Every structure is written in structure tokens, then in C-alpha cells.
């Protein structure tokens, strides 16, 4: 019965893959979101303007006629990337931002200072997967350790640099972001709002809930839920929809990533509704991101209805299937 | 190449399953171990003397010609279990011990325990007759973080139980935490523990970094490195109320590598050499025989084995998988090169 009309959303953190997987997955995004930040971690990664232009065209080839969807491309930062290449792509409208992945990506921030300094000067946002990767650091501590040892030093060095702390998963990061300045923002996925590590590990191991940064303790989940529900205007929708074929997930060494594009928007609506915070929902989906990136808000509107839809058990691929996040379950809100 | 000769070991915590899976897995135990504690979590559970007798015989049927292997059977504790049934099984040599799995208010009375308070008549009987209680010590309340469940058990159940029943003999099965290590270390002669090879060799990072590894997924869940190190130090100290219990817990490959993978490591094929590797790395090989072959017997009041086996420090590759009638079994350390093997 209940209907919720919002400004059309965007997705500020998306993996579209390539090839036949890209053809399969893009329509789940393009049918809903006006734009999406398309991450650059292809094999090999998108590190040149030329590669980004080609990738962008493959994505557009795969967008059904009638979907008004614009992929916003990103550069994968590498220790050796030429700052002139990053800037050229930016000037051309090809690169919207650059993405910093930990080594096991970038080995040190120090190795890429010239690039980061260029980004700071030209006003290019830096998107950060914020985890340290030393073998001795427990996997649940890697996000927290990143804040102290990399993020805060980096932001102290480049005080004009705009940073998105991508897919934050901890109370540590939530507090860090809440207390930061207008040059620091974050994205949060649906899974890190809806679940905690118990949902991945109790009663069985659930690889479809296995993603990076790893699901944390409930106290962390609660901190993220309170953050979005507070109305804080520098957090915004980024799904980290990260699809893998079923048997790449269900194997002796399962790939990280949740394929949440089909269910994310309604999943977010449920969280906000639960937190008694639907008045902040549009801003999270459709306003906060644009503001941070200095892009206009979308000028169309969509509707969500609170009618329970059943999530497909699987989606066909050329070879194998794709298991969506919440496969076989129910979502309380769906797109009208 | 170096040789380690020990009295024939026993496995104080084992899952043998049933049917065809039992036929496949028993030889990996019977070739090496003189005795094993056979856990009772079949579907349906072993909760009667008659079922334990028939199960013991199915196990015996699957032992290869010439292996000298004796299964020591256990009773699954449930709300509806009659203390007279348990006592009779004990008195007749059928039940060596009884096994308490985590309580759950939704448990069918035929299949489990709703709360420990609700099975005090049976626990009092075990105390009275000197039957050892084997405890899977986790609390499973939905609002407890899975990594916290063992420590919460110590506080909520273990300590109060042992204060209530001061003569009760308890083995804290497959301990995984420094909490449990210290607790057991500081206990009396009526408290012991078993430790698996996976909890000595690995921590949760091994299960979750670079990929999710369901063949390392087991209960109680792998913990953070500080806990793994405490376990290692406990065994390496020569503490004589910790002993070998593999928790070898086989599931078909398709049941492990699924959207909801089953908990358990099939480590019977590789456990003993893994334990040897750990003791060696801890410079504690002088304590290795006792852990494998003496401490368990002393705790249970049974004789130490009088035959010997040899481990050799020569590298071998572990099978990638082991055929079942349908599907396959992936062993602990599948495909890896291991340092010690049985001669
Ligand atoms: N997060 C994930 O679990 N997966 C992402 C990578 C990423 O965002 O690190 C992927 O590309 O597979
Ligand atoms: O408690 C248990 C049960 C066992 C099994 O599979 O039977 N597997 C485990 O991982 N631990
Ligand atoms: Zn990431
Ligand atoms: Zn991502
Ligand atoms: Zn157990
Ligand atoms: Zn067990």
C-alpha cells in the first residue's frame, strides 16, 4: 500500500565487470540509477584515458534503449601512474575520480604523492578502499588500522583533497567521517547496514555475504545504521555491487563481493524505515552524492511501494549462474 | 630423515557419521588410532543404549581386516533422556561418556537440551557414577557474536555447573580461545580439554583473507591469532590435561562448497602429522607423545596403548580429494605438502 516517491538515485560505488558479465549486470543498475561510479578494477585495470573511453562505450552498448544511464568512470591508481594522464582524463570528462586500492593496487601513498597532489590541485575526488593489508593484522582490524596509519596522515598532508571513504564498515570509520570536514565523505552498502558477521557465519558459512571490507561485529553495524539515520549529509548510496559467477563464490576459496544491484534500493528503504528515518532517505540516495561531487541532482523521480517482492534464486549467465544478494528471500520495498 | 616413535595414539573427539560415509572415513582413523571417542550427533542422535550398540557394530563392520581399533561410544544428552538409560549404558560398557551440545530453547526434547538447568537430574547421575561429561562449550543466543560464544559459555554455564556439581568430570572439547586455555590451565584434576589440529595451525585470517575458505569453517569458529597462540602455548607447556581430539568432521564437497557451507574439517587423514608439526615448531616435541597417547587415557582412567607407531619427517602430498559413493571428500590440507607422515 504505502508509496514513497524520491528523486531518482545514483550509485556512487559500482562494479560492472566486463564482457558477457557486464551485459548481464548493467540493466539492473541502468533501469534505476541515473548515474553510477564505475570502479576500475578490471583485469587488467583501467589506468589510461584510452582504456576508460573504450570501457565506457562497452557499458553504453549494454544499456537497454530507454534507460537514461550515465556511467561515471574512474582511474585505478598505481604506483607508477603519470599525473598528466590522470589530469588529461579528468579534463576530458572521462575520469570522474580516481580509486585507491591497498596493495593486496597502491604500495604506498608516498610513492604516488605527485598524483595525489595533482588531484588535490585540480579538484578530483579520491575514492579509498581503506584497509591495511599486512599479514599480521587481523582481517577485522584492517579498516580501523587504516584510519590511523594512512587516512589521517594523508588528509593532514593534502588538506584540500576531497576523499570518499568507500564502503565503511566500522564504528571507527563512522565516527571518523561524522567528525570530519566537508572534504571527507563515505559510502555505505546495503549489506553492511542490514547484516553483521553473525549473518555470514552462524548456522553455516555464507559466501554470498562474504565481501570486503568484511562484515564486522553488530556494534559496528549499529553505528553505521545510526550514522545514515541521523541525517548526516556526507554519507551516500554506494552499493559495491560486486558480481561473481556462482561457482566462483561457492568454492574452496570463494571470491569477495555481493551482487546487490537488483535489491539494494529497497534494502536501503527498509533500513531507513526501521531506523524511523525515511525523511533522510532521498538525500542519502539522490542528493548527498551529487553535492559532494559537485554534480547536479537528477531531474526525474521514481516510486517505491511497500509490497513484498521475492528475489530470484539465480540469474542466468552465458556459463554458470549469478546468485543475487538475498536470493530466494523477500524485500519489503520495491520499485513501482 | 628424522623419526618420531610414539605409543599408538587415540582420538578423544571424532565424527564417524554413518552409512557409506562411515565406510569411507573409518579406515583413516582405524589405521592409526587404537581407540576413539565416537560422537553421537547422528540424524537422529544416539540417545539410547540400543542405538549405541548397533552403531558400534556398524563401525566395527567398516574396520579393515587387521586394524586394532575400538570405538568408545557416547550418549547425546537431551531433555527427554532418562538418567536410568544413561546409567545403564555406562554400567554396561556401552557409553564411555555423554556429550552436551549447546542448549537451545527451541530444541525438540528428543534431539537436544533446552537449558542446562533442565537436565540436572541426568548431570547429577553422571556426577554420582563417575561418568565423564564432554562439553561443546558455546552459548548460541542470537544476540551473542559468534566469536564471543565460547567465552560466554565459560561464565554462563561451565563455571556455575562445576560449582554446582563439584565431583563432575568434564572435558572442554575443542577449545579455541585463550579464555578456555587459561580456564582449563587453572582448573582442577576433574577438568580437561581437547584441541584440534586446525585451531593450533590456523586462525580466522586463514579462513577469510584472500578468499572465504569453507574447508576451514568449523565450530567453534577459528578465532583471532592471540587465541591460536594461547592454544599453542598450552600444548607446548606440557600441561597434562590437554589431549588429542581431532574433531574430524567430514561433509561431502558439495555440502561444504555451497551457499551455506557445513561446519567441519575432515582432518583424520592428516591430523597426527599436523600435531607433530605444531609441537616441533613450538620446540615442545618432548610433550608430543603425552598429548597423543597418555594424557587422554589418564583422564578417562583407561590404559595407555602398548604398541607403537612411527612418524617420519619426510615430505608427502595430501590427496586433493577422497572418493565417496556419491561426491567426494576434501581432506584437511588437501593438495598440500606436509612435513611429517606416518611410516
Ligand atoms: N568488495 C568486494 O568484496 N569486492 C569488490 C572489491 C572491493 O570493493 O574491494 C570486487 O570487485 O569484487
Ligand atoms: O560441533 C561441531 C559439529 C561437527 C559436525 O559436523 O558434526 N562440526 C563442527 O565443525 N563442529
Ligand atoms: Zn573496495
Ligand atoms: Zn568496490
Ligand atoms: Zn563440537
Ligand atoms: Zn565434534
Curated annotation (Swiss-Prot), chain B:
Protein name per its UniProtKB record: Dihydroorotase
Catalytic activity: (S)-dihydroorotate + H2O = N-carbamoyl-L-aspartate + H(+)
Induction field: Induced by pyrimidine limitation.
Assembly, per entry: Homodimer.
Family: Belongs to the metallo-dependent hydrolases superfamily. DHOase family. Class II DHOase subfamily.
Domain notes: There is an asymmetry between active sites in the dimer, with dihydroorotate bound to the active site of subunit A and N-carbamoyl-L-aspartate bound to the active site of subunit B.
Record annotation: effect of changing residue 247 to S: 3500-fold decrease in catalytic efficiency with carbamoyl aspartate as substrate
UniProt effect for mutating residue 247 to E: 24-fold decrease in catalytic efficiency with carbamoyl aspartate as substrate
Pathway info: Pyrimidine metabolism; UMP biosynthesis via de novo pathway; (S)-dihydroorotate from bicarbonate: step 3/3
E.C. designation(s): 3.5.2.3
Gene field: pyrC
Keyword tags: Hydrolase, Metal-binding, Pyrimidine biosynthesis, Zinc
InterPro entries: Amidohydro-rel, DHOdimr, Dihydroorotase_CS, Metal_Hydrolase
Any GO BP: pyrimidine nucleotide biosynthetic process
UniProt cofactor(s): Zn(2+)
Amino acid at each position: 500500500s504505502q508509496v514513497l516517491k524520491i528523486r531518482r538515485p545514483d550509485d556512487w560505488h559500482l562494479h560492472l565487470r566486463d564482457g558477457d558479465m557486464l551485459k548481464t549486470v548493467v540493466p539492473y543498475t541502468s533501469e534505476i540509477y541515473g548515474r553510477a561510479i564505475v570502479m576500475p578494477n578490471l583485469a587488467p585495470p583501467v589506468t589510461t584515458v584510452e582504456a576508460a573511453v573504450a570501457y565506457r562505450q562497452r557499458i553504453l552498448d549494454a544499456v537497454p534503449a530507454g534507460h537514461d544511464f550515465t556511467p561515471l568512470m574512474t582511474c585505478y591508481l598505481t604506483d607508477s601512474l603519470d599525473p598528466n594522464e590522470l589530469e588529461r582524463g579528468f579534463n576530458e570528462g572521462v575520469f570522474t575520480a580516481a580509486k585507491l586500492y591497498p596493495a593486496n593496487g597502491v604500495t604506498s601513498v608516498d610513492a604516488i604523492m605527485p598524483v595525489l597532489e595533482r588531484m588535490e590541485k585540480i579538484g578530483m575526488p579520491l575514492l579509498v578502499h581503506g584497509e591495511v593489508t599486512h599479514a599480521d593484522i587481523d582481517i577485522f582490524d584492517r579498516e580501523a588500522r587504516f584510519i590511523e596509519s594512512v587516512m589521517e596522515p594523508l588528509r593532514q598532508r593534502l588538506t584540500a583533497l576531497k576523499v570518499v571513504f568507500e564502503h565503511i564498515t566500522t564504528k571507527d570509520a563512522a565516527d571518523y567521517v561524522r567528525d570530519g570536514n566537508e572534504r571527507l565523505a563515505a559510502t555505505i552498502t546495503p549489506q553492511h547496514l542490514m547484516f553483521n558477521r553473525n549473518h555470514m557465519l552462524v548456522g553455516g558459512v555464507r559466501p554470498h555475504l562474504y565481501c570486503l571490507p568484511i562484515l564486522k561485529r553488530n556494534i559496528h553495524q549499529q553505528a553505521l545504521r545510526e550514522l545514515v539515520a541521523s541525517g548526516f549529509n556526507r554519507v551516500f548510496l554506494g552499493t559495491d555491487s560486486a558480481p561473481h559467477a556462482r561457482h566462483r563464490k561457492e568454492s574452496s576459496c570463494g571470491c569477495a563481493g555481493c551482487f546487490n544491484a537488483p535489491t539494494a534500493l529497497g534494502s536501503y528503504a527498509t533500513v531507513f524505515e526501521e531506523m524511523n528515518a525515511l525523511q533522510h532517505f532521498e538525500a542519502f540516495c539522490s542528493v548527498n552524492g551529487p553535492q559532494f561531487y559537485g554534480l547536479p541532482v537528477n531531474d526525474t523521480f521514481i516510486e517505491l511501494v511497500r509490497e513484498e517482492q521475492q528475489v530470484a534464486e539465480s540469474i542466468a549467465l552465458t556459463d554458470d549462474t549469478l546468485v543475487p544478494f538475498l536470493a530466494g528471500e523477500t524485500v519489503r520495498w520495491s520499485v513501482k
